[PDB]
Amino acid sequence: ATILAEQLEAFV
Amino acid sequence: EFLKPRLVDIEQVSSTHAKVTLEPLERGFGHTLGNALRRILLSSMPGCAVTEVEIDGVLHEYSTKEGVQEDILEILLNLKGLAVRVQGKDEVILTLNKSGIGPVTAADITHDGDVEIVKPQHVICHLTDENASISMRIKVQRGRGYVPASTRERPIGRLLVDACYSPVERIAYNVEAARVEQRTDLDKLVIEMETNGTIDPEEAIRRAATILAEQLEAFVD
Amino acid sequence: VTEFLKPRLVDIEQVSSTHAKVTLEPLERGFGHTLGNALRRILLSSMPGCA
Amino acid sequence: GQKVHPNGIRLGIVKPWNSTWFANTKEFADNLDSDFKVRQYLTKELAKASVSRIVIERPAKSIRVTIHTARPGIVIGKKGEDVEKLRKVVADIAGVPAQINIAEVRKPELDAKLVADSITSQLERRVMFRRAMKRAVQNAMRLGAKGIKVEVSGRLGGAEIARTEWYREGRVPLHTLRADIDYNTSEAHTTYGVIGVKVWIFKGEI
Amino acid sequence: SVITVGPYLRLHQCGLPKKMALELFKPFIYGKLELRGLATTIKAAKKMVEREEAVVWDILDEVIREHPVLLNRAPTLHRLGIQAFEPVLIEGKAIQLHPLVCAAYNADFDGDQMAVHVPLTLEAQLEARALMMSTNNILSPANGEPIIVPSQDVVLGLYYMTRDCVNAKGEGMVLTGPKEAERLYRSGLASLHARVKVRIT
Amino acid sequence: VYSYTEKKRIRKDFGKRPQVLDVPYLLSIQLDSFQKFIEQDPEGQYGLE
Amino acid sequence: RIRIRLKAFDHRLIDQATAEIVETAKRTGAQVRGPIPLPTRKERFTVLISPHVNKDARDQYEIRTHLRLVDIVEPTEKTVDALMRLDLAAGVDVQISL
Amino acid sequence: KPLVGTGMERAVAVDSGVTAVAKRGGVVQYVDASRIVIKVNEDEMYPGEAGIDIYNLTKYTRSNQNTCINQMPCVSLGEPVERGDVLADGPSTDLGELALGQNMRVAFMPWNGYNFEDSILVSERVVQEDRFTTIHIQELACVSRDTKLGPEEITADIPNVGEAALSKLDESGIVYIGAEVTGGDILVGKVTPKGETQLTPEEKLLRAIFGEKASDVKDSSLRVPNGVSGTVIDVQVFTRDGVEKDKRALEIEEMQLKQAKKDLSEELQILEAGLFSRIRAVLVAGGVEAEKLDKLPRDRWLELGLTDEEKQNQLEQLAEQYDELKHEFEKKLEAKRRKITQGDDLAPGVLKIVKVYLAVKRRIQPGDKMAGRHGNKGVISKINPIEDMPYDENGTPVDIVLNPLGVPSRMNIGQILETHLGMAAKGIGDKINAMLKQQQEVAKLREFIQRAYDLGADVRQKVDLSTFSDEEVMRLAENLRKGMPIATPVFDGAKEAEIKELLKLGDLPTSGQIRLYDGRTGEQFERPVTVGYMYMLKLNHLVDDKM
Amino acid sequence: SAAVKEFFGSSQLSQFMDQNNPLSEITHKRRISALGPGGLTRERAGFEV
Ligand SMILES: [Mg+2]
């Protein structure tokens, strides 16, 4: 979950 | 040290649909973010569809009005397919008045200060006499998903249509190889959406990523 | 309109040792598959390590 | 010589008005008297329909009439035709276009006006008010009202003097401004003068 | 009502709609409602389930639990055409029936209908669980052959799964267990039919 | 040439054998029999006659 | 420059009613010169509560008529054309001052 | 419509009696959802009885199987029609063809067990489009019989009913045309089951002011049961003669008097308009008055300057027709007032019959029965979301996932050829939609439509678009953009090579099989699967009629 | 009137039309039934007929 959340911090 | 996706190019190739582009991505994340954002965009996006219609001289939706060559039921289907944007309200009431021989297009609605029709050539019905006029009130509201009439009207003059609060139609991702970065084994995620005009594409991909990162909040720090 | 059913791990029934069984609820009529598929594909490869 | 109106003093915190518009000083009387005849004629037109309250909302150059009833069908009358007959004459009375609208109450045993005119229909009949006003009390106690006081006055029972009787069941905190109270009046004309009825129905908080 | 599949179920349980469940179990719901203290007289309970308030569905999931029902295909020829299941409540109007059990009922899904019966008394609940339960009927009484034989989709899934081809992804590689065999099939590094030395225990 | 509602949406047609007798009026048993029944014609020929 | 003068009775409604024209003017002009307070008249009345003698018993009644200003600055067509239709405010008498 | 038909649809549609076939051809004058007016051409027209025809369509009414036999007008205004031609489509018709069910995107693959024996698995895209949402109509009757202690009461003067109980009836008991009712409300109020109710001093006091002896003997209003929703669309009230008509029966009598009055007056006005158009058509020649014709009132167009010819003879014959219409209108309006005003002979000892038509709209749900046209039955088993559907490398989800295993045992191999030819038809339709959405001129549309209509061996069709004149081709492409209909006669049908050559005209794969991705996993199904369009029918063995 | 009304009213061949489809009308009117008066039933018929 940390990997998948760090792969979305350039959108939200 | 995973490479992070950043939006690079938003090719608005037509008025309805666009092709957003993510770059760069490590191998495996292409199909993961592609299927994930496809499933979020098709599942739950805020649309702006219609809920209630009140034609003036019509009691129930199975009747017929003198001077229009379609039934009231067909007028309800044609209003169910209405593609409309609202800006600063929860729900809104649009007013329609039209008199004379010919079509009643979707541009004959008296627009408010924030409601915006995105396809004004949309036909509703056809008036077919010199003094035979429709005059209706339309109720358009926000929502999410598909809320039918059977789940959710107090006078006998309201007419409830089904509510398809869903702006997108067809989301297709196509992963492909990346060469912009000298480093190989990187991927590009190209998502061609298919909107009906009520949702900006970068706003759609931003709301989808916000929904998914809200779902992973249950077990992330 | 952006308010969903925020879920949680109601229990971690870790069966025996080197083996767990983590159940999450409640999700939308379609989000169980997208979180299962996302976590399944990431754990399979992305997750680093030494061997 | 006491007990100021319950529906009188709650009108800034609990219950709204029954005419919500703004008109300036030149046309304030013109707006008000026109409201008085659309309340007179409509209650006269819909006496038996069991209408409790009427809301009059004028957004200027227009009037939204709202009718709160326990009999929805009789108010609509003839699938709209009755309302269209009103539409021609309600606009004729107030001299302004009228957008007639209809509301409804599900429980007439909890609405004060609907309790009061019931006893009016009873006592114009030769029924025993003692078990006619007891009837209305036991009605509201099991229909969800936290408390109800019913008062009748006049020379009831054909007596010479004006025997007055009141009866309650449950909480009725008249002084408490937080306490919502549904109160209305009705009067009955028998051959023994006029018998007025007053009923209070308490529900709850803000 | 009309039957339909529902393949998530086990052979011991079947899907049963909420509307049929609230109609067949009216006295048990009445007894449960009178036990809690929500209402008083029987009339009040019949008004509550006539209105179908928010609290009778928890009452219904209390009475359905551990109470078998007799499903019955309309031309019952042998004793495997009346079998007892445990209900699982269904949003819908169709009985969801576990697929393997269909080969006992001679029930396809081309418009078939089945009847549900409720064992009222306590000896009948125990007879439905201990004699007529669907886990107890796994051999046909006419012979020794199993009647919960996997019928049509599942044998195609197995026959495509356990087979082989002379070249695929991962031909002739060696695997330290069946767990990484499924891990190689899921990640996309081998094929479902590719001959391989494994180490099985 | 085609009728005007056959220029709305002309159905693509495969088929090889050129037809020679079109499909008759499909309700001719009922209508022809009952026209034979009730029709002013004596010589003891019509149904009632 | 283009003033919009609000008039109402329900002060708990006018702050949302001005907010309904704030959002109608925010998306169009993007510059609105605030919801100015504008003091309220308190028309005071007194009434002999009795239908007869005893001029000691009276009841006092008042009507707080609340005012506001919106004051659209720019003469952009966006604002007027949008707000020409959407002014909302039922029971809330609205007026322009320009 | 059927994308893959046999060309036999027009015989079954026209040669039945559900469509409104034109009797004499001509020019349409007034289209409406109620009526259609044809002006008859002059080379088809009688000399007398001037003549413009009126087709009164049959709107929403009850069939025998509780379906909804509707007629919709399918012609525009100003449009020419020929003798022997459809004007109004009926139930399950479209432009004069025969459209029983609807054509949907089907794929043959096993999908996670939910189509195990014969079951069908349907996307939510099907139910969102409101495309199987059938409309049913139920007739509910209520008679006012004649028993002992007196006759019955239909009036709404009733005790016990706590106002919310009905909240639908007017002052005279009958429900409303336009009222959406639930399962178990009151439609017609009838105080009738009368056993015995206890009377107290206060109930005895009713004799004084009200006058009623005891309020009959008991108190209970005939309330109706549950299971069905609906919307009351039509109320009939029949009265045995002698009985007092109440206020709503007089409302229906005034309503039907007004309707029949307006209808016969419009018969006279419309046929008088056709007669005056005939007078204008005759007086073009032979003593024409270009300015003097519209100075005088229109009913005197006979005494103008014209000798004894065929034209004054024709104006005398039209005067005969006009006076016949006048006296005929008088006597027929008197007879129609007699038919509305009179009573009706009825059952022994009944006062009045109230019939109410509920109009339920039943959509689709797990448990209905759908089937194709080859014997592939099935209970629809799960109504999936949109996302879970197997999509292809374009983006479009498939609508229905059948089961392949029903094909080699139940030997109906025709459904797979129907599937491939339906995909060919939709490929041609998608190419027309692509060539028209880009706003292309009519030359490229003419090119592609001509190539799609030649395409075969020695065939019967042999059309050419060089005699359609650049406006019909745009409207023909407006009708072909949702797919191109293809006829395939029974034993002389389209062979395999013709289906392959038509799948080659569109850019579809030759074998008919597209590779399909998965919706859940997002990863490809091995061994590419068969998709296409099958024309599937909803059968009326529903599940909320058996449960 | 009793004879002709009994035949058109309740016979074994004067049957209720299934109105739910144009096809069902036009194929119920074209029906060659072997049953009725002067025929057999479902119990009498064997395999030949
Ligand atoms: Mg079967």
**Domain of residue H140, CATH code:** 2.40.50.150
Of D65, D84, D106, the domain-final residue: D106
Interstrand relation of H380-384 and H120-123 (parallel, antiparallel or unpaired): parallel
With beta carbons less than 8 A apart as the criterion, state whether H498 and H492 touch: no
> CA-CA distances (angstroms) from residue B105 to B122, G86, H92?
5, 22, 28
**How many Å apart are CA D18 and CA D30, to the nearest integer?**
17
> Is the residue at D11 inside a domain?
no
Same domain assignment for residues H476 and H391: yes
Same domain assignment for residues D100 and D111: no
Same domain assignment for residues H419 and H501: yes
With beta carbons less than 8 A apart as the criterion, state whether H428 and H505 touch: yes
Of B142, B165, B188, the domain-final residue: B165
**How many Å apart are CA H245 and CA H340, to the nearest integer?**
13
**How many Å apart are CA F43 and CA F32, to the nearest integer?**
19
Same domain assignment for residues H127 and H2: yes
Q: What is the DSSP letter of E201?
A: -
Contacts of B110 in chain G (CB under 8 A): 85
Same domain assignment for residues D200 and D114: yes
Same domain assignment for residues D84 and D145: no
CA atoms within 13 A on the CB side of I33: 15
Residue H103 parent element (H or E): strand H102-108
Those residues whose C-beta lies under 8 Å from the C-beta of residue H271, and which sit 6 or more positions away, are: H50, H51, H52, H325
Backbone torsions φ then ψ of H397, nearest 5 degrees: -75, 150
B127-141 residues labelled b (16+ CB within 10 A) or e (exposed):
bbbeeebbebebbbb
Q: What is the CATH number of the domain that holds H265?
A: 6.10.140.1670
Residue B100, sorted as left (phi over 0), alpha (psi -120 to 50) or beta, turns out to be: left
Q: What is the DSSP letter of C45?
A: I
Please tell me whether residue H357 adopts helix, strand or coil conformation. Answer: strand
Domain count for chain D, please give it: 2
Q: Which chains touch B (3 or more CB pairs under 8 A)?
A: A, C, D, G, H
User: What single string gives the DSSP state of each residue in H482-545?
Assistant: T---EE--SSS---HHHHHHHHHHTTS-TTSEEPB--SSS-SPPSSPEEEEEEEEEE-S--STT
Same domain assignment for residues B158 and B52: yes
Those residues whose C-beta lies under 8 Å from the C-beta of residue H409, and which sit 6 or more positions away, are: none
User: What single string gives the DSSP state of each residue in G20-73?
Assistant: HHHHHHHTTTS-B---B----EEEEEEEE-SSSS-TT-EEEEEEEEEEEE--B-
Same domain assignment for residues D98 and D138: no
Same domain assignment for residues D121 and D94: no
Contacts of H379 in chain E (CB under 8 A): 2-4, 94, 109-112
Same domain assignment for residues D198 and D119: yes
Nearest to E136 by CA among E104, E88, E99, E97: E104
Interstrand relation of H486-487 and H4-5 (parallel, antiparallel or unpaired): parallel
**How many Å apart are CA H39 and CA D48, to the nearest integer?**
54
Same domain assignment for residues H373 and H501: yes
Q: Note whether G26 contacts B88, CB cutoff 8 Å.
A: yes
Residue H402, sorted as left (phi over 0), alpha (psi -120 to 50) or beta, turns out to be: beta
**How many Å apart are CA H123 and CA D189, to the nearest integer?**
68
CB < 8 Å from A in window 16-45 of B: 29, 32-33
CA of B49 to nearest chain C CA: how many angstroms apart?
13
Same domain assignment for residues H143 and H235: yes
Residues of D with CB under 8 A from a CB of B: 76, 79-80, 101-104
Same domain assignment for residues D152 and D79: no
User: Which pairs with CB-CB distance under 8 Å and at least 24 residues apart come from H344-350?
Assistant: H344/H238, H344/H239, H344/H240, H344/H241, H345/H240, H346/H238, H346/H240, H347/H143, H349/H145, H349/H146, H350/H143, H350/H144, H350/H145, H350/H146, H350/H240
Q: How many CB pairs under 8 A join C and H?
A: 9
User: What single string gives the DSSP state of each residue in B95-147?
Assistant: EEEEESSEEEEGGGEE--SS-EES-TT-EEEEE-SSS-EEEEEEEEE-EEEEE
Contacts of H544 in chain E (CB under 8 A): 93
Q: What technique determined this structure? A: cryo-EM
**How many Å apart are CA B74 and CA D48, to the nearest integer?**
40
Contacts of D24 in chain G (CB under 8 A): 93
Domains in chain G, CATH or no CATH each:
1-98 (3.30.70.600)
Crossing angle (nearest 10°) for helices H442-454 and H472-480: 60
Residue E77, sorted as left (phi over 0), alpha (psi -120 to 50) or beta, turns out to be: alpha
Two tokens at D200?
């209070």
CA of E102 to the centre of ligand 1 (A): 10
Breaks in chain D after (C-N > 2.5 angstroms): none
Backbone torsions φ then ψ of H26, nearest 5 degrees: 160, -145
Q: What is the resolution of this structure in A?
A: 6.9
Q: Note whether E7 contacts H113, CB cutoff 8 Å.
A: yes
Please tell me whether residue H95 adopts helix, strand or coil conformation. Answer: coil
Residues of C with CB under 8 A from a CB of H: 29-30, 33, 37
Backbone torsions φ then ψ of H98, nearest 5 degrees: -130, 105
**How many Å apart are CA F32 and CA D141, to the nearest integer?**
75
> Is the residue at D8 inside a domain?
no
> Is the residue at D6 inside a domain?
no
Please indicate if any CB of chain D lies within 8 Å of the CB of H219.
no
User: Which pairs with CB-CB distance under 8 Å and at least 24 residues apart come from B7-12?
Assistant: B7/A10, B7/A11, B7/B202, B7/B205, B10/B201, B10/B202, B12/B201
User: What single string gives the DSSP state of each residue in D141-197?
Assistant: HTTT-SEEEEEEESSGGG-SS---EEEEEE---SS-TTS-EEEEEEEEE-SS-EEEE
Two tokens at H469?
């004149």
CA of D86 to nearest chain B CA: how many angstroms apart?
16
Same domain assignment for residues H370 and H274: no
Strand locations in D7-146, DSSP E?
Answer: 51-57, 63-69, 98-104
Domain range for B218 is 1-46+166-221
**How many Å apart are CA B213 and CA B216, to the nearest integer?**
5
Q: Where are the alpha helices (DSSP H) in H283-394?
A: 310-341
Domain range for H50 is 18-92
Answer yes or no: is E108 a known binding residue. yes
With beta carbons less than 8 A apart as the criterion, state whether H158 and H192 touch: no
Answer yes or no: is E110 a known binding residue. yes
Nearest to H100 by CA among F14, I27, B78: I27
With beta carbons less than 8 A apart as the criterion, state whether B50 and B137 touch: no
Please tell me whether residue B159 adopts helix, strand or coil conformation. Answer: strand
Same domain assignment for residues D118 and D172: yes
Q: Say if residue C26 is preceded by a cis peptide, omega within 30 of 0.
A: yes
Please indicate if any CB of chain A lies within 8 Å of the CB of B6.
yes
Residue with tokens 């072909």: H480
Same domain assignment for residues H326 and H356: no
Please tell me whether residue E29 adopts helix, strand or coil conformation. Answer: helix
User: What single string gives the DSSP state of each residue in H154-177?
Assistant: -SS--SS--STTTSS--TTSB--T
Q: What is the CATH number of the domain that holds B54?
A: 2.170.120.12
Please tell me whether residue H352 adopts helix, strand or coil conformation. Answer: strand
Contacts of H108 in chain E (CB under 8 A): none
Please tell me whether residue D92 adopts helix, strand or coil conformation. Answer: helix
**How many Å apart are CA H261 and CA H255, to the nearest integer?**
10
With beta carbons less than 8 A apart as the criterion, state whether H483 and H532 touch: no
Q: Note whether B114 contacts G26, CB cutoff 8 Å.
A: no
Residue G27, amino acid = R
Same domain assignment for residues H427 and H452: yes
Of D106, D130, D153, the domain-final residue: D106
Of D86, D106, D126, the domain-final residue: D106
Those residues whose C-beta lies under 8 Å from the C-beta of residue F2, and which sit 6 or more positions away, are: F10, H463
Contacts of H498 in chain F (CB under 8 A): 14
**From the list B2, B209, B212, which residue is nearest A3 (CB)?**
B2
Q: Note whether H205 contacts D126, CB cutoff 8 Å.
A: yes
Same domain assignment for residues D175 and D112: yes
Sign of CA dihedral E128, E130, E135, E141: negative
Interstrand relation of B186-192 and B172-177 (parallel, antiparallel or unpaired): antiparallel
Q: What is the CATH number of the domain that holds B10?
A: 3.30.1360.10
Residue H458, amino acid = D
Answer yes or no: is E61 a known binding residue. no
> CA-CA distances (angstroms) from residue H58 to B64, C19, D181?
12, 70, 56
Backbone torsions φ then ψ of H30, nearest 5 degrees: -155, 115
With beta carbons less than 8 A apart as the criterion, state whether E19 and E92 touch: no
CA atoms within 13 A on the CB side of B92: 24
Same domain assignment for residues B1 and B78: no
Of B117, B145, B165, the domain-final residue: B165
> Is the residue at D9 inside a domain?
no
Same domain assignment for residues H355 and H219: yes
Domain count for chain B, please give it: 2
Q: Note whether I18 contacts H91, CB cutoff 8 Å.
A: no
CA of E2 to nearest chain H CA: how many angstroms apart?
6
